[PDB]
């Protein structure tokens, strides 16, 4: 299951000033970048061109070029159309793309958010105000739908061009997509919010892809207070996940951090609290502690 999304952030500051930057993610790998700086889309990977010929891609870049330019001027007008209602600064976000499934099957989307809240979506052959959205949006919606010419080509991109690109991108980037990166791990500790309690931290960094399994163990028994963190991103498109455990001071011994990843095969990373290894690391990373939360 792969989710290909194109992200568009546009900042309207006043009647003159505006900015549009765009990024494109396949699953969770960046493939495309379009800065307001440059008049052309950029590839961030070698295989970002997809399975398309130089001219075949030109029609896209060119159409999109026409779009950026048009999009700005259209909202800039739509603002003028609502004389008192909706004044600057304006923030508009577009998340559009298609999800991938077993077989030829796919499902595309185009979601639009005005000032943070998601308010407009493209569906079938027309834009529509989401259920639970402000009614003033109706007049601008009515104005935009009259354009069969746009509403036509948007169906083209959603119904056809999206999956016919992404079925390409996947078959063209299987090499980078199925790469395996081994995680390094280290232990540490901080005081707990609670008096007399402490917090044990298991750091996991440099692994690819995402799906990983970190747990605090006393032998065969997983510790239920093992709280998984969030996935923090690394520069080189790997990942970072820490897993913390709260302990009664002087119950730190006997515990160990076990890491299960696709990268390693069967050989789990098992770090033992207070092993000659753990001590070697901890002495290798000592400091003054200002300023520590």
């Amino acid at each position: 299951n792969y989710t290909f999304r194109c992200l568009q952030m546009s900042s309207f500051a006043n009647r003159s000033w505006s900015r549009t930057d765009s990024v494109v993610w396949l699953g969770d790998l960046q493939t495309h970048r379009w800065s307001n700086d440059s008049a052309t889309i950029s590839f961030t990977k070698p295989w970002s061109q997809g399975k398309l010929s130089n001219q075949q891609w030109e029609k896209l870049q060119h159409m999109f070029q026409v779009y950026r330019v048009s999009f700005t001027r259209d909202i800039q007008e739509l603002v003028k159309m609502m004389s008192p209602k909706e004044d600057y600064p304006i923030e508009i976000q577009l998340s559009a793309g298609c999800e991938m499934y077993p077989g030829n099957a796919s499902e595309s989307f185009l979601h639009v958010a005005f000032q943070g809240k998601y308010v407009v979506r493209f569906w079938g052959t027309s834009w529509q105000t989401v259920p639970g959205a402000p009614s003033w949006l109706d007049l601008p919606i009515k104005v935009l739908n009259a354009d069969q010419g746009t509403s036509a080509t948007v169906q083209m991109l959603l119904n056809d061009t999206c999956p016919l690109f992404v079925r390409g991108l996947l078959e063209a980037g299987k090499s980078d997509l199925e790469k395996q990166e081994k995680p390094v791990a280290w232990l540490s500790s901080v005081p707990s919010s609670a008096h007399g309690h402490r917090q044990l931290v298991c750091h996991v960094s440099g692994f690819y892809p995402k799906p990983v399994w970190v747990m605090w163990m006393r032998g065969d028994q997983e510790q239920q207070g093992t709280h998984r963190g969030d996935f923090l991103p690394n520069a080189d498109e790997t990942w970072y996940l820490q897993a913390t455990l709260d302990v009664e001071a002087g119950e730190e011994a006997g515990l160990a951090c076990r890491v299960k990843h696709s990268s390693l095969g069967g050989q789990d990373i098992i770090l033992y609290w207070g092993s000659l290894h753990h001590i070697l690391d901890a002495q290798k990373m000592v400091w003054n502690h200002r300023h520590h939360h």
Partner: T-cell receptor
Amino acid sequence: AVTQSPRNKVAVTGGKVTLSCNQTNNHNNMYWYRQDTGHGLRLIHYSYGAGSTEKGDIPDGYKASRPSQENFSLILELATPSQTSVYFCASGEQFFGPGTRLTVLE
Amino acid sequence: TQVEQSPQSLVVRQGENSVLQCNYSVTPDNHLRWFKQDTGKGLVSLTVLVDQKDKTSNGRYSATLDKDAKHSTLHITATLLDDTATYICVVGDRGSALGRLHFGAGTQLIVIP
């Protein structure tokens, strides 16, 4: 169609000049243009609906006012010689007025 | 200057064919419309061109559009005296409300009897 008036006027540098524009065709947005030899029409001011106006390509020296949906007006507070043109009031797919000949003199 | 017309002025003989050219550089090109302006009078629509390769006819008027060469021609088939007028070519960048029209300087057509 579009019923603009006066169909013809002359005024001196500095006089107040207003150009009425009427239409029963029922169009939301409507426009003020001006024609000069070897140029083709140029947008001055333009409206989207009642009680609302916006600046076009060449808005300097002029103003606009929308009271009704049916009416429109292009306003010269201080007139100038260089504002000697013909004035067309469009309505919109876009249907145009018969034109107004304004010679502004020294 | 977005939309240039050739020739400047043109002269044809009563009841003979005449060709008119419009050559834009407007993006986007939703549509191109041709207008006939009698002297003193306003602008009357003649016909509208929409598709990438389009071709229409109306009375003796018959025009064709190539959106990929951003170029149009307007033909009059056997010109009348009632035809001496200026022929303005306009291009519309959007097919909605939020679009503006680009006007040519027009061609002056003179039909000699």
